[PDB]
Amino acid sequence: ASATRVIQLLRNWASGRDLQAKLQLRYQEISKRTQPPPKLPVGPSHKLSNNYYCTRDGRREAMPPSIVMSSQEKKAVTPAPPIKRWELSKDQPYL
């Protein structure tokens, strides 16, 4: 941090990069280990009115698989439209 200026300009030159800008280990940049007490939020069903679980029951909304054809001019349809080609990322195309 500790390390004097002479060691610093050696490590900056040998690496060629300014390592003192950010270190691979933390001296004082962290959250204080103990934290002030929190207050957790609430959700979409912590109400007392019109929250009947019957009209929210995702388990009961699942119907059985829908029949299509049973062993017991029409167009040609693809399972999904062909995937459009992606573009060369505008950030940096090559590398």
Partner 1 sequence: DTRPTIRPRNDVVHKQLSAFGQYVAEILPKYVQQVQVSCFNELEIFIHPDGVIPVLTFLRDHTNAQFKSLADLTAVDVPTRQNRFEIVYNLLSLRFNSQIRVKTYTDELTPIESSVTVYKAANWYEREIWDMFGVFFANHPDLRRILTGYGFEGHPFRKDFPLSGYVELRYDDEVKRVVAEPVELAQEFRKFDLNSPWEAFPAYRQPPE
Partner 2 sequence: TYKFVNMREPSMDMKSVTDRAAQTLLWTELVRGLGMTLSYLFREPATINYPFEKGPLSPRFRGEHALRRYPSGEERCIACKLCEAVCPAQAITIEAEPRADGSRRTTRYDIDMTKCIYCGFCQEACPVDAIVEGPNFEFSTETHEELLYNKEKLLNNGDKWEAEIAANIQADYLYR
Partner 3 sequence: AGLLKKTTGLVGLAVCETPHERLKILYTKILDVLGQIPKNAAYRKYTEQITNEKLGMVKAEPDVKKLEEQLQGGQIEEVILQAENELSLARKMLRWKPWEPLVEEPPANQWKWPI
Ligand X SMILES: CCCCCCCCCCCCCCCCCC(=O)OC[C@H](COP(=O)([O-])OCC(O)COP(=O)([O-])OC[C@@H](COC(=O)CCCCCCCCCCCCCCCCC)OC(=O)CCCCCCCCCCCCCCCCC)OC(=O)CCCCCCCCCCCCCCCCC
Positions touching partner 1 (CB under 8 A) are 44-45, 55-56, 58-71, 74, 76-83
Of 11 and 60, which has the nearer Cβ to ligand X? 11
User: Does 6 contact ligand X by CB under 6 A?
Assistant: yes
Task: Determine the 3-state secondary structure of 85 from DSSP.
Answer: coil
Q: The tokens of 51 are what? A: 């929250």
Q: The tokens of 20 are what? A: 């003192």
Q: The tokens of 45 are what? A: 């069903």
- Residue 10 — φ and ψ, nearest 5°? -70, -50
- Residue 34 — φ and ψ, nearest 5°? -85, 150
Of 40 and 95, which has the nearer Cβ to partner 1? 40
User: Does 59 contact partner 3 by CB under 8 A?
Assistant: no
Q: What are the C-alpha distances in Å from 52 to residues 42, 43, 56? A: 17, 15, 7
Stretch that binds partner 2, among 2-10, 41-49, 52-60, 71-79 (CB under 8 A): 2-10
Q: Which does 73 bind (CB under 5 to 8 A by kind): partner 1, partner 2, partner 3, none?
A: partner 3
Stretch that binds ligand X, among 3-11, 27-35, 54-62, 74-82 (CB under 6 A): 3-11
